[PDB]
Structure 1
Amino acid sequence: SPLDIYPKILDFHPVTMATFTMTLARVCLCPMIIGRGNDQVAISSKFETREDIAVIRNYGNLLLEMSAVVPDGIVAFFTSYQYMESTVASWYEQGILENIQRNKLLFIETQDGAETSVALEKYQEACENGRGAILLSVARGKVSEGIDFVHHYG
């Protein structure tokens, strides 16, 4: 997206400055930014609010009531493994993770290659049928770029 930073990050003399946006018969994607929750409180993942209970509850509610509208798999990314595990532990402590459990299966991506592969395989097989599943991972992980979520997956 920023074509002015790469030519100055490394010695470069671009002559293109070209971007392309795909078009089809219909809008194939619906990006949107969700700010404050139903409590009118921001859900920003600020370092001073990582342990805040309100933002964790808002994230849990978003993941819960979102999981009932989009079928066959949702891929969620967290900032880091520590924050991800703390958030899922907080959700487990409350009676909110169980509500998500009955809608879609919860799968967690870890550093183990074999465990990650088997989790991906079971997520794929769960999305193949109507059970549906949630794949929780990290943005800066080997699973972020190692796989592509083709149609009907995620």
Structure 2
Amino acid sequence: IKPVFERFSSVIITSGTISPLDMYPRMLNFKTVLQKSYAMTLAKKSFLPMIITKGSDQVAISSRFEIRNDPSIVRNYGSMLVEFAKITPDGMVVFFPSYLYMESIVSMWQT
């Protein structure tokens, strides 16, 4: 990327989830005149970000690779998938850390 930042004078780097902004100048050797992130001024809350640390049984849930075939975690994630699918009106997207972890866990749910 060094030739790009030298051949061109003005370059704009924009994205929806580019944070923290201080790291990119460190990783890629370039300087910026200004770097900021805008916060949406939505009158009414439109998205509900929440974090789940344990299942309905109060047991911690994690996607650690070493315990992928964990009977307790698989059920907890399986319960989460089913319960959410019951209330989601139209569409639901599930993102897994890696294909192999998804490939193994999906097989566990099938059985």
Q: TM-score range by the shorter chain?
A: 0.7 to 0.9
TM-score of the two chains, using structure 1 as the length reference: 0.57
Quick check: 2:65–2:101 contact (8 Å CA) kept in 1? no
Post-superposition CA distance 1:61-96 (Å, at most 9, x none) = 001111111210100011111111111110111xxx
Equivalent in the alignment of 1:71: 89
Within 5 Å, give how 1:115-130 maps onto structure 2: none
Give the % identical residues: 53
Measure the CA separation in 1 of the matches of 2:42 and 2:82. Answer: 31
Aligned length: 93
Post-superposition CA distance 1:68-127 (Å, at most 9, x none) = 11210100011111111111110111xxxxxxxxxxxxxxxxxxxxxxxxxxxxxxxxxx
Q: How far 1:39 sits from its partner (Å)?
A: 1.8
Q: Does 1:39 align with 2:57?
A: yes
Equivalent in the alignment of 1:81: 99
Q: Does 1:8 align with 2:26?
A: yes
Q: How far 1:47 sits from its partner (Å)?
A: 1.9
Which protein, 1 or 2, shows the higher relative CO under an 8 Å CA cutoff with sep ≥ 6?
1
Q: How far 1:15 sits from its partner (Å)?
A: 2.7
Measure the CA separation in 2 of the matches of 1:76 and 1:39. Answer: 22
Q: How far 1:21 sits from its partner (Å)?
A: 1.2
5+ residue gaps, structure 2: 1-18
Q: CA RMSD in A?
A: 1.1
Secondary structure of residue in 1 paired with 2:95: strand
Q: How far 1:14 sits from its partner (Å)?
A: 2.0
Q: Which has the larger radius of gyration?
A: 2
Measure the CA separation in 2 of the matches of 1:23 and 1:30. Answer: 15
Quick check: 2:68–2:101 contact (8 Å CA) kept in 1? yes
